[PDB]
Design an enzyme around this catalytic site. Structure first.
Site, PDB file in Angstrom:
ATOM      1  N   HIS A 172       1.069  -1.180   0.196  1.00  0.00           N
ATOM      2  CA  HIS A 172       0.012   0.395  -0.057  1.00  0.00           C
ATOM      3  C   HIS A 172       0.975   1.403  -0.132  1.00  0.00           C
ATOM      4  CE1 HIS A 172      -3.428   2.779   1.171  1.00  0.00           C
ATOM      5  NE2 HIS A 172      -2.448   2.948   2.269  1.00  0.00           N
ATOM      6  N   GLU A 173       1.924   1.311   0.829  1.00  0.00           N
ATOM      7  CA  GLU A 173       3.045   2.437   0.950  1.00  0.00           C
ATOM      8  C   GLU A 173       3.237   2.658  -0.335  1.00  0.00           C
ATOM      9  OE1 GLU A 173       1.258   3.626   3.953  1.00  0.00           O
ATOM     10  OE2 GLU A 173       2.638   5.028   2.950  1.00  0.00           O
TER      11      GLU A 173
ATOM     12  N   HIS B 240       1.902   4.049  -2.454  1.00  0.00           N
ATOM     13  CA  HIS B 240       1.717   5.868  -3.076  1.00  0.00           C
ATOM     14  C   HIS B 240       3.353   6.560  -3.092  1.00  0.00           C
ATOM     15  CE1 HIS B 240      -1.812   7.133  -0.649  1.00  0.00           C
ATOM     16  NE2 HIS B 240      -1.176   5.519  -0.064  1.00  0.00           N
TER      17      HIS B 240
ATOM     18  N   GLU C 135      -5.859   8.457  -1.391  1.00  0.00           N
ATOM     19  CA  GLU C 135      -6.075   7.373  -0.677  1.00  0.00           C
ATOM     20  C   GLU C 135      -7.198   6.288  -1.583  1.00  0.00           C
ATOM     21  OE1 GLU C 135      -4.145   6.338   2.091  1.00  0.00           O
ATOM     22  OE2 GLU C 135      -3.189   8.002   2.807  1.00  0.00           O
TER      23      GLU C 135
HETATM   24  S1  LIG Z   1       2.847   8.301   1.230  1.00  0.00           S
HETATM   25  C1  LIG Z   1       1.116   8.603   1.679  1.00  0.00           C
HETATM   26  C2  LIG Z   1       0.879  10.126   1.691  1.00  0.00           C
HETATM   27  C3  LIG Z   1      -0.187   9.818   2.366  1.00  0.00           C
HETATM   28  C4  LIG Z   1       0.185   9.500   3.518  1.00  0.00           C
HETATM   29  C5  LIG Z   1      -1.167   8.881   4.542  1.00  0.00           C
HETATM   30  C6  LIG Z   1      -0.643   7.284   5.626  1.00  0.00           C
HETATM   31  C7  LIG Z   1      -1.790   5.580   4.540  1.00  0.00           C
HETATM   32  O1  LIG Z   1      -1.040   5.835   3.352  1.00  0.00           O
HETATM   33  N1  LIG Z   1      -2.398   5.459   4.651  1.00  0.00           N
HETATM   34  O2  LIG Z   1      -3.511   4.635   4.287  1.00  0.00           O
HETATM   35 ZN   LIG Z   2      -2.608   5.410   2.127  1.00  0.00          ZN
END
Ligand SMILES: *SCCCCCCC(=O)NO
Ligand SMILES: [Zn+2]
Length: 423
Positions: free
Chosen positions: A223-224, A227, A262
């Site tokens: 998941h990270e 992002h 998200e």
């Molecule tokens: S690098 C991700 C940017 C937003 C951080 C929020 C944390 C998250 O991903 N929760 O699911």
């Molecule tokens: Zn997230």
């Protein structure tokens, strides 16, 4: 094949190549920390993040003013050499678990190719790197050398369970939203995991559930990484764009809003809460940003540095953004190839899709309520494996996600804090 080709031990001697003391540039003054290069362009720092933000240079709990109910603090975690050794083996194991799937091999490939753009020059004709996209590595002679990189996995800051992407910004460019990209620092820990409820009505209710099933940390890390993929290609949606939840009565009773970034990252049903007209506005925007990247590469005849040619640097960005090379030698953006790459980073790389590949039980939506947080130890193969996670084959934990069942496999989870009812 394997993603991490060396089983590192934390006490392995430094060599200045893939085991070295490093410094983060333009942070504030810091002591060099021992880092490990597990893959090309990807490093791991088994330390609590007290660097990326000068504000959080304190692991003790703050005065509960901006404090979150879903929080956990422990200033002693990841302070001993044995903890950092197991942290390194845990992060290593999760990267191989992700790489053992076709979807994870595709995502990790795109992350390695997602080199942050070389748009640091104020002169249009010359290509130059952006300084905040590298680290300083101490060589075996005490001297520093700069080395570009895409990803850094680092321990969490004060709040252990807040896994957040952090990258260094610019007072002229939004590197994570202008298509350029930037080096991503991911706060993450493989020694903790969250509990969720197996029924949608209970999981999305803030008053019910103790967290019977545990989230696979491979899903959390992926998941990270999703992002980070968005930010490395500079197509992340501004966190101001939010969906004020109308599907959950408890969300709107408190007015809780969730960013489009998200909802896109989770995928599945959550992604369609982003309405089609705004998604088209996002795609056109990033399509324009890709052409300016093509334009600045066309207006570039020089280069700064002696570590790469201009033809090689023009080439690696052609492979990253999938630009088209004409006969005159200037690059362009094919709409069919942009939509292809943009959809791969936003629609294919999703948490919901990784759940399908891992064959694990998981939260059905991002619009739920946290239940609990557990302490785990995934390094021993009797607890957690590459190909099965917690649901070890040929044991009683193989079927029905019994390995993730914290009541059946209780010896693998220690509940540290309950979140239910504290909303
Ligand atoms: S690098 C991700 C940017 C937003 C951080 C929020 C944390 C998250 O991903 N929760 O699911
Ligand atoms: Zn997230």
């Amino acid at each position: 094949m394997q993603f991490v080709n060396k089983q590192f031990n934390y006490k392995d001697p430094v060599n200045g190549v893939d085991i070295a003391y490093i410094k983060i540039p333009n942070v504030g003054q810091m002591q060099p920390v021992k880092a490990f290069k597990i893959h090309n362009k990807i490093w791991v720092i088994p330390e609590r993040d007290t660097f990326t933000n000068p504000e959080e240079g304190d692991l003790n709990p703050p005065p509960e003013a901006k404090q979150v109910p879903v929080s956990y603090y422990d200033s002693t975690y990841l302070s001993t050499d044995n903890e950092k050794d197991n942290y390194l083996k845990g992060v290593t194991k999760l990267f191989e678990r992700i790489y053992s799937t076709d979807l994870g091999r595709m995502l990790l490939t795109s992350i390695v190719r997602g080199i942050p753009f070389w748009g640091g020059s104020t002169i249009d004709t010359e290509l130059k790197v952006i300084d905040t996209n590298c680290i300083n590595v101490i060589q075996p002679d005490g001297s520093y050398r700069s080395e570009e990189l895409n990803l850094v996995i680092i321990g969490p800051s004060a709040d252990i369970i807040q896994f957040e992407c952090k990258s260094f910004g610019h007072e002229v460019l939004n590197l994570t939203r202008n298509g350029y990209g930037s080096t991503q620092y991911i706060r993450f820990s493989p020694d903790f995991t969250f509990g969720f409820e197996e029924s949608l009505e209970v999981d999305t209710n803030p008053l019910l559930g103790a967290g019977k099933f545990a989230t696979d940390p491979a899903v959390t890390l992926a998941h990270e990484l999703i992002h980070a993929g968005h930010r490395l290609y500079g197509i992340a949606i501004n966190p101001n764009r939010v969906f004020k939840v109308n599907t959950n009565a408890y969300y709107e009773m408190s007015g809780l809003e969730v960013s489009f970034e998200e909802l896109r990252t989770f995928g599945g049903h959550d992604a369609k809460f982003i309405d089609s007209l705004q998604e088209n506005e996002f795609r056109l925007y990033y399509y324009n940003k890709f052409k300016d990247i093509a334009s600045t590469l066309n207006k570039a005849k020089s280069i700064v540095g002696t570590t790469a040619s201009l033809q090689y640097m023009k080439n690696v960005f052609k492979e990253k953004y999938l630009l088209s090379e004409d006969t005159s030698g200037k690059f362009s953006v094919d709409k069919l190839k942009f939509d292809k790459l943009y959809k791969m980073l936003t629609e294919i790389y999703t948490e919901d899709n990784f759940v399908k590949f891992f064959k694990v039980l998981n939260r059905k939506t991002y619009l739920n309520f946290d239940k609990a947080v557990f302490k785990i130890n995934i390094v021993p193969k009797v607890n957690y494996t590459i190909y099965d996670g917690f649901n070890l084959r040929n044991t009683n934990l193989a079927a029905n996600f019994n390995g993730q069942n914290t009541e059946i496999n209780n010896m693998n989870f220690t509940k540290l804090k309950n979140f239910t009812g504290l909303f």
